[PDB]
Every structure is written in C-alpha cells, then in structure tokens.
Amino acid sequence: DIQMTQSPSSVSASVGDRVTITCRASQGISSWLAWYQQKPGKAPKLLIYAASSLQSGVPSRFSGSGSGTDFTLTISSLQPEDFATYYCQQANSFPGGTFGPGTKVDIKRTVAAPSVFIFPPSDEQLKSGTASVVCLLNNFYPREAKVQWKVDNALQSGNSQESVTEQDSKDSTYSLSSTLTLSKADYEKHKVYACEVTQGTTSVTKSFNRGEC
Amino acid sequence: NLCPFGEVFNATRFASVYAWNRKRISNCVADYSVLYNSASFSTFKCYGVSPTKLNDLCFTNVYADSFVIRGDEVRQIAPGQTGKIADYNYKLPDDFTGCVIAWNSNNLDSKVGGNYNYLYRLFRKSNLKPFERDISTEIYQAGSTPCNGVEGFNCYFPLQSYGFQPTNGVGYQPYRVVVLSFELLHAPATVCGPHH
Amino acid sequence: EVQLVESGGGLIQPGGSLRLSCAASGFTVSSNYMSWVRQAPGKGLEWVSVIYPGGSTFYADSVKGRFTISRDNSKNTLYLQMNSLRAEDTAVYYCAREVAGTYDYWGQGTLVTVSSASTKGPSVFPLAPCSRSTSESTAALGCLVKDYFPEPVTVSWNSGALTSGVHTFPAVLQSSGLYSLSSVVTVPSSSLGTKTYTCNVDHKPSNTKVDKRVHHHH
Ligand SMILES: *[C@@H]1O[C@H](CO)[C@@H](O)[C@H](O)[C@H]1NC(C)=O
User: Which cysteines are joined by disulfide bonds (chain B)?
Assistant: First the structure.
C-alpha cells in the first residue's frame, strides 16, 4: 500500500519552455521508478527507467532524476508534439507495477481565431424525425470558446453537446464540433439557425435560414 | 555442548539469496527456545513441528540456510509459495520440516546511494526444485537470437541488485533469514533439544 | 521490430466472460515476464495480471479469482480470460513485456465494454453548407455518424487518399446512451461538384462499413 502521487495534475507550457513535473512515493522505493508518455488513443511509451536512464529511441530532451520518495521528469525544451499524459510508475512493487495518476501537459501558444462553419440537418435525417444542426470551429486557440446556439434569436440551452480534437502536432490549435439536437417538429417551426462563437470580447455568428438554401 | 547457532545468526556477512549459504549443525544440544523466546526476530515460523515443543525433539542433523531478501519476500520462504524468490532463488518443499527465522537488517545491509552487493536471480526459464541452488551467470536469452555471452537487447544478465537504501519502505528493506531444516535419517540422532 | 498485436475485446453483458489475445513477435513470450495493464475511459493505468517465465501467475486484488492469465508457446501468444465481468471492468486492455518491473513494449490495446445495451450500427448523414452560392473560397464538408454502440468508429475520406485538413472528432455519449461523432474536411470551394468527397465509416463492433458520398444540400 504505497501511494504514488503526481504534481501538478496539469501544466500548460509554450514551445521551447522547460517543463518540470513531480512524482512522489509514500515510502522509499530507491531508483525503482519509470516514466511513460501516453498520447491520446495510444499505448503508453516508456521514457525513463531506473529513475534516470533514457529508453533507446526516446528524444534527449526528456530526463529523469531523484531517488527514494521524490522524482522529477524534465522536458528541457518542449516540442509541439509533446502534449500527452505523463505517468510515473513504481517498478519494484509486488505483485505488479503501481502507476501514478498522471500529469497532463498541453501546449500554450498565441491566440488564433476559429474559422466557423454551420451545417443544416440532412433531408435524409429529417425523414426519421430528428434534426442535428452542426457548428464547426476550425483550427483555433485557446481551447475555451463560448459556443451559443440561437433559434429565431432565442438562446438555446440543454440541447447541444461539444467535442474537441487533440492539439495539432505542428501548430497546437484545436478544432471544435457543436451539435444542436431538435425534433423535426421543433426544427420546422423555426427559420434562423445561428451558431455564435465568442473569444474574449469578439463574437462571430454563422447562420442559415431554413426556408432558403 | 550447545549448538553453535551464534556462528550462523551473528555472522558479519550474509550470502545473496541466489547463492544462499548452508551450514550443517551436528552433535550438539539445541535450545530452540532461546531463539523462539528472543525479541530479535520478526518471523519465527515452523512447519512439520510445534514451535513450543522444539526443545523436546531429536534429529540426525540440522541444516542452517542463510541469506538476505527484502521484507515483503520473507513470506515466500514457506512451503507452497511462488514469486521471484521461491521460484528462482530458494525453494522450500511442500513437506518441509523445520523453522524459518528472519529479522530486519536495514542498519547493516542498506547503504547511502544503494547497496549493490545483494543480488537475486530475476531471469530463469523454469522454477527451482526444492533446496536447489543455482549460481550460474549465463546471459539469459529472452528471444530467438543467441546472446553468445553478450548482454544487450533480449540478452539479460540473470541476476538483479536489490539496491537497498536506508530510506526504503520497510517491505523493501533487507531482512536476514535463517532456515533450519530438520533431517531424520535411519541413524542415531546427533541434535537434541535440552528438554528431550 | 517487436510487435504485440491484441485481439478479442468487444461488448459483453455484465456477468459475461471474454478472452483477450496478444500475439507477440521479436521476443519469446514463454521466456519473459508479461503483464496486462488496463485503462478505464478517461482514467489512469491499472496493472492487472502478470505471468513469470517459470509459469507463476499473479493478479491485482481488483480482478483476483475472476481473471486468468495464460500463454501458448507454439503461437507465441499471451491470453487473459475474464469472468464475472462488471461495468468497472470496462477499459482498454494492454499487454506489455516487462523487464525488471518496467514495460518496454506494449500492444495497441483492445477495448472491452461491459454493458447490457445492444450493438447498434451508425446512421451516416452528410454535412454540407446550406447554400454553395454563399461559400467562401474554402468550404467545409463532413459526415455525421449518429447513434451507434459501442465504440469505436473510424472515419476515412476518399478511401484514405484525402487526409489533409481532415478532423475526426471524439464521440460524445448522448442522453439516449448512444454515441455520435462528426468528421469534417475543408476543401477549395471551386472543387465542389467537380471532385467527389466520400466518407468511409467503419463500425467493426456491428460489422458494418458505410461509404457515403457527400452531395450539395438538397
Ligand atoms: C548473537 O550475539 C548476541 C550478542 O553477542 C547474543 O545475545 C546472541 O545470543 C547471539 N545469537 C545467537 C543465536 O547465539
């Protein structure tokens, strides 16, 4: 019943920054400590074993230090492809390895305004009694963007869901999809469908008119 | 003429578990209760015999096996156990007759920066038979490519260091272990308890 | 090249059983410590089971009694047999080779979903601008992949010939308990109605592939 903790739980840092993340064991584990990087939707990759030894094929910007209870992973010069969750792992536990909870690293960069597109529901879907209206926010930064749906200028809530891609491996931007779900009946009652995207004090609204187009 | 348990229990150096030491004890009176009643030991477990009746028993010979392992491995020094120690280093049989004695040795056997002296066998393709001792150091072939005596990918040195540091959690600290095996042959007994 | 290729994950009712496979090349399974490690969606890594070169096996308290790790030497394959599965066991399961307690090589993972809900194939609908007449020089198109269970789906475009500017979003779980996702691409608006754009939606859990040409909004 060793507890492995990691700090901070998340860190946002710019390309070229030095990033330092911490792992603690609740009792001394000598140098029996490994570090892994796990990209979204991929298996973890071993970075560091025996607290400080760099695994073959891993870039030299990754390094580990410490012994006993307190360990550090350092990225000397953060690359845009380095966003990931980083896990430490006690390597001498029995019967099995004991993983820390992970630290999520994201890439900070300059603001980038989204390209905004709106899509009406397909005639094919409408035939089946539901209308999905989709709003795309393409290649923007930062992640936090207020997306608001308006139907005949009435603000919607409770009837949309959002999803975001992983940061671009080169330019660190995100894209975002928002889907507004209505019954066919509700859809047909209204004319103007608008997605309003606010970053800071600038809002951009893309719309269509159900009657036209 | 009292059994010289002192030479075993109080030895300055203890063996690495893969290279466990055996000392034969013969022709003496064995006051087991001295050890049993000792405050020194964190484990004192017997098998095939009652620990409280030890001072009453006669055997042909006694064997004292001694070595160092980590705290949480002491439980593997028992009949019917599995793990790196029981499987690849020191194996007791199901029908074991004797006692297992252990004590924390963090003060003697850990070093600042890690003690690289105490080893266990990590890589072996099959389990040891009971009381088998393997001291070989052949490079272990973990793939289909021969190693030809050279360490590298899929080619491992079979022994690993514990790397005992004084700051280790207690379960990862070194423990000295003495296993007393009680041998009964068709011959006069040479080792008897004082209360026989 | 070390390769660990996993198989056998899918949808299973609570109390059901499933067997995972992990076919290895580049080391000998029977000569190695091999583990299974799992990760529940959005959660951390959890070690679950290990088999030693000499054959000993050990298990996390969370799975003891229910799971059995085994191997087949002739097939150089590792297995995990799981019984009395429950929702808490829903996870991606990885196999990994272990050297002195660290995992140097991992499989790609196999998703196990423990649920009493039915398999449901997706409905694929076009995403196209309301009117091309008002399209800027860059247009977006896509496919909405609606109402499927369980995960995952993959999306490609033009059978993988179109990759630049593709964004396929993570699925959202709807209140129905079915998943939905979109995949989008941006293209020159001048290409519209002279080049064709087809999304290739594969939902292996229902053994269904949909190819859907995205037309002008009708
Ligand atoms: C080991 O040494 C200590 C102190 O010299 C002594 O009390 C003890 O009896 C010895 N142990 C044995 C088993 O003789």
Answer: 3-28, 46-99, 58-192, 147-155
Spell out the domains of chain A, with CATH numbers in brackets. 4-108 (2.60.40.10), 115-209 (2.60.40.10)
Resolution of the coordinates in A? 1.7
Both C104 and C14 in one domain: the answer is yes
Residue numbers in A near B169 (CB within 8 A): 2, 25-29
Of B5, B9, B54, the one to substitute when testing ligand 1's pocket (max ligand atoms within 8 A of C-beta) is: B9
Identify the helix (H) or strand (E) that includes residue B107: helix B106-109
Residue type, C174: Q
Query: Which residues are CB-contacts of C192 (< 8 A; sequence separation ≥ 6)?
Result: C132, C135, C139, C216
- Domain interval for residue C140: 123-214
| Residue B150 in tokens | 């050279």
The CA distance from B77 to A3, in Å, is 27
> Domain ends where: C114, C132, C166?
C114
Domain residue limits, chain B = 1-113+166-196, 114-165
Query: How far apart are the C-alpha atoms of C179 and B66, rounded to whole Å?
Result: 61
Measure CB to CB from residue A46 to each of C104, C125, C146 and give the nearest one. Answer: C104
* Centroid of ligand 1 to alpha carbon of B105 (angstroms): 15
Q: Which residue has the tokens 């620990």?
A: B51
CB within 8 Å of A56: residues ≥ 6 apart? none
| Domain identity same for C89 and C54 | yes
Strand positions, DSSP E, C73-195 = 77-82, 91-99, 102-106, 110-114, 123-127, 138-148, 154-157, 166-168, 172-173, 179-188
What residue type is assigned to position A30 of the chain? S
Is C97 found in the same domain as C131? no
* H or E element in which residue A160 lies: strand A160-164
| Cβ within 8 Å, pair B142-C52 | no
What's the total number of domains in chain C? 2
Atom 12 of ligand 1 has which residue's CA nearest to it? B6
CB contact under 8 A, C102 and A138: no
